[PDB]
Amino acid sequence: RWRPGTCAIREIRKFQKSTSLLIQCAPFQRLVREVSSAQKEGLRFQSSAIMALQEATEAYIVSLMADTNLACIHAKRVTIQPKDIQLALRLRGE
Amino acid sequence: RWRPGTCAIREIRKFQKSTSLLIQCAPFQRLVREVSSAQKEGLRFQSSAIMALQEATEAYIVSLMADTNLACIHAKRVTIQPKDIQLALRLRGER
Amino acid sequence: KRSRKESYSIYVYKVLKQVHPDTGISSKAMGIMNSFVNDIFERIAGEASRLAHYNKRSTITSREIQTAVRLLLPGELAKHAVSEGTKAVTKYTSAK
Amino acid sequence: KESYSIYVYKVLKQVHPDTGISSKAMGIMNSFVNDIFERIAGEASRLAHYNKRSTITSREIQTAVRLLLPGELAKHAVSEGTKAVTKYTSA
Amino acid sequence: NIQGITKPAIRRLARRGGVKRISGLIYEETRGVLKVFLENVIRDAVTYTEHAKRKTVTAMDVVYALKRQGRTLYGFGG
Amino acid sequence: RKVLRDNIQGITKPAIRRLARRGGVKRISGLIYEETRGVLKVFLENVIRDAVTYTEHAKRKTVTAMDVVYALKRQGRTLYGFGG
Amino acid sequence: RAKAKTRSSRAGLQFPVGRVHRLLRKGNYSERVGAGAPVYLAAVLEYLTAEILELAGNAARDNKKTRIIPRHLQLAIRNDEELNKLLGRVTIAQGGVLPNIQAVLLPK
Amino acid sequence: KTRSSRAGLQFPVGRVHRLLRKGNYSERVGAGAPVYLAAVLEYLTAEILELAGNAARDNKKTRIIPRHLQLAIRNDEELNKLLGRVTIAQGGVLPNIQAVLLPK
DNA sequence: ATCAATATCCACCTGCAGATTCTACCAAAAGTGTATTTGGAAACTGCTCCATCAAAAGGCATGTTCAGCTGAATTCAGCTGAACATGCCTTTTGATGGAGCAGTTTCCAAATACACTTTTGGTAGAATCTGCAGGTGGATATTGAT
DNA sequence: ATCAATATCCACCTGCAGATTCTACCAAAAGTGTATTTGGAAACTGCTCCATCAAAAGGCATGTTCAGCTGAATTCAGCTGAACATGCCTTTTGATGGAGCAGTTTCCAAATACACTTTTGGTAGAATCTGCAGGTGGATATTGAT
């Protein structure tokens, strides 16, 4: 039986080596059309256009996760907490 | 005798209420000309132009101090340390 | 050998007397105002130019100014801004 | 509709005569070239307006390159640009 | 339907970011921040499309919407 | 002009203390002042670099305030109050 | 002829629509510039200046002064959410800062 | 005989000239400016393509994919400073795990 | 520290389906060659604005002490999150039908760019006012010790 | 809770540095009248997008255990803030020299606008390579017991 954190660390290598989409495409399009119809009904989407949203969201959130983890390392911890996410957004000029 | 931290807290109020320059103008003007002559000999400055540098540097450093102090509050301390500044610079998208 | 240069000082003073007839304004604050007006004008005009180029169109109508205002101003600022702008445009078109 | 694919392919055959490139990477390259062209042209236009000048000479492009490229890259960029300008003017 | 973004997907995104340990209370703040970003981007993109007098949202509209927020994206036409 | 030497000594410790007090800091470690002067000098070098480039393009020996405003705006730092 | 009324009076504004028109033409934004664009833009500029000037005037009177100085402008911009979101990337000379001390640093 | 060959470039000086004129950047456009700009663009493209090709050799592949571009940009100092505000589709990220989280 | 034993990657080989590379043509930019304008470079010069330069002071920085209070270091109990196994269903992948838009062309009514001529509001001093900066004095609020 | 001791607001006064108003010009909008584009309206034309439907599968959701991690509680050495004496240097203010801008004029080397004449890169097919997904075998790393 593997130690806790070991299967997680060697997972980090899998995802930092791969580049494929890390989000299921079907739920992501469901949400995109939800918000799009929330701002304007009867809007259509290019197949390429929705792929652009997934890449941008993945990159933004990945960077946010790295910065949150930096906030934890600084706070002398490993477990990320919502106390850390709101710190990153506060220092990001956002 | 004032208790430690009290004279410091009431300092924050005065300096956060005032707007005047918190750095002596002569040493700041000496350094600006140092760097400018470091990049090109025989360069002059408008009297107003150096005032522009001081305001921008002061504002930048004040904002950096506020974010560093936020990093300290998050790390559960009050004393700011260089371990906190390099965190702020890393998250500001500038370092 | 004495020169001249245009500025928005007089109009800012007119608006100041509009909203607060008693209050004055310093020269430094006037320079702040000029820089602010120029920055906003540059932002709006730039986004308008990009909007024009994006549709293979070479002209700038008030529609592009309206959409740029909708893009650059956050919320009720954009709502009231569009309201006053449409009011002024509809008042100007009638040429009354 | 125009695109920079062929010229990117030419430069690739210049620096790597055997190696190919995927279509996604080609789109990356085109997007990059357009973004950089936009940066340079924008700073050049602003520099033109700042001096009540209505024309854009290669001097403004040189100063914009010196402003937008950080350090070790701007020297090489200015060298190649002035090289191309001299080689074009002299013949 | 924003709840459709599953927990293991957020775990994978965090693991790509280099995080070792994840609290359970993270997922709420995560979906919230994602929803804010998506709402902003879709707002600007839909304005870009609605100005062009069209009903279809092309990828260039998204690229412009992101570029307005200081987030250049390559790979879809600019 | 002059072979200046040690002008960083002009940024006093109590001056950095005052700047930090404006930033809302209550307690300060001794190791702060070094990193402070470092970051300040780096920022100043960048801004003066861009301003001197603007001047050398403007065919002049004097660095006006508009040059500083442009240099700051290039770094995403708009400044009001000296455009006129 | 038709006796001249300025464009500002025809639109009911305080900002000169003609000067904005000249800046739009000579500004290298587009080759041709419509007729309603300078009216619209001058209207928007007037509205925003009125906003920040009213805020600065009230903030100045709360200090019991009858003349707007840069500090009043900084307080007026930083105490509002939307204006601060618009000018987050801006600093004001002679401006000062917003008085804010975290609750962790306060006495107990 | 073309301007691109007369200047010793691979990028079309004519296309840059047309884009500069029709782009609403300035009323007048110099003659050496498009040459200069096309030269700079060619140089930077050559830089990034050499870096990506070398990274593809380190991966032992003969076709440039977005991952090679991301790795080539993020491993270089100047290019990373230039494109810090940019994301690359199909790109991934730089493999980096903090030293605090490792065993031993 | 060793050591046996999984599990887990890593290195090299391998076939193939899908992109990739190579070919055969043309509207539209690119190139050449005149007929012109024109911005801007060159030369003075009028003149602000910068750079030194002096000097006392008094405001502030420096150096040293001392104590209180904070950051660092340690222990540890409880719990939260990871690992793993399970089974079920939501996702992908493939294929069709057709419908609602974009996109292409064509042709004007309307809007805007120019080319000149007057009419002013805007700007730069001159001449006036006038809130604000320092400086006192009183009345509170705050802080620290019993 | 009291009580002494500072630090802090608040108002007032006055002289003045600066904000305001008044006046005299003048660059630039406003007005008149042509000449030029262009967005847009109408009609097609394909073309991606949306909506279903099946099936293979692998990822998701659940539940259980357990280990390591995080928060709470304590201690204390050392560090940093407040204080005080000492002395050093940054501020104001005036005046000059002159250097370096701005402003003004003048005249080409260069840029623009067109009229034709080529060249080409873009689009739509025909015909090849090569990383993706696996597969073994070896090389490491982990985890657990001596």
Author numbering:
A (entry chain A): 34 to 127
B (entry chain E): 34 to 128
C (entry chain D): 30 to 125
D (entry chain H): 34 to 124
E (entry chain B): 25 to 102
F (entry chain F): 19 to 102
G (entry chain C): 11 to 118
H (entry chain G): 15 to 118
Authors' description from the paper:
Histone proteins, H2A, H2B, H3 and H4, assemble as a core complex called the nucleosome, which is the fundamental unit of the chromatin in eukaryotic cells. On the other hand, Leishmania histones are evolutionally diversified, and have 48–60% identity with human histones. LmaH3 (XP_001681421.1) consists of 130 amino acids, and shares 60% amino acid identity with human histone H3.1 (H3.1). In the present study, we found that the Leishmania histone H3, LmaH3, is incorporated into human chromatin in vivo, and formed nucleosomes with human histones in vitro, although Leishmania histone incorporation into infected cells has not been investigated.
We performed nucleosome reconstitution by the salt-dialysis method, using purified LmaH3 and human histones H2A, H2B, and H4 in the presence of the palindromic α-satellite 146 bp DNA. We then determined the crystal structure of the LmaH3 nucleosome at 3.63 Å resolution. In the LmaH3 nucleosome, all of the histones are actually incorporated into the nucleosome, and the structure of LmaH3 in the nucleosome was similar to that of H3.1. In the crystal structure of the LmaH3 nucleosome, the LmaH3-specific amino acid residues, Trp35 and Gln57, which correspond to the H3.1 Tyr41 and Arg63 residues, are located near the DNA. In the LmaH3 nucleosome, the corresponding residue, Trp35, also interacts in the minor groove, but its hydrophobic interaction surface is different, as compared to the H3.1 Tyr41 surface. The side chain of the corresponding LmaH3 Gln57 residue has a neutral charge, suggesting that the interaction with the DNA is weakened in the LmaH3 nucleosome. The replacement of the Phe104 residue by the corresponding Met98 in the LmaH3 nucleosome may affect the interaction with H4, leading to the reduced stability of the nucleosome. We found that LmaH3–H4 dissociated from the DNA at a remarkably lower temperature than H3.1–H4. Mutational analyses revealed that the specific LmaH3 Trp35, Gln57 and Met98 residues, which correspond to the H3.1 Tyr41, Arg63 and Phe104 residues, might be responsible for the instability of the LmaH3 nucleosome. Nucleosomes containing LmaH3 resisted the Mg2+-mediated compaction of the chromatin fiber.
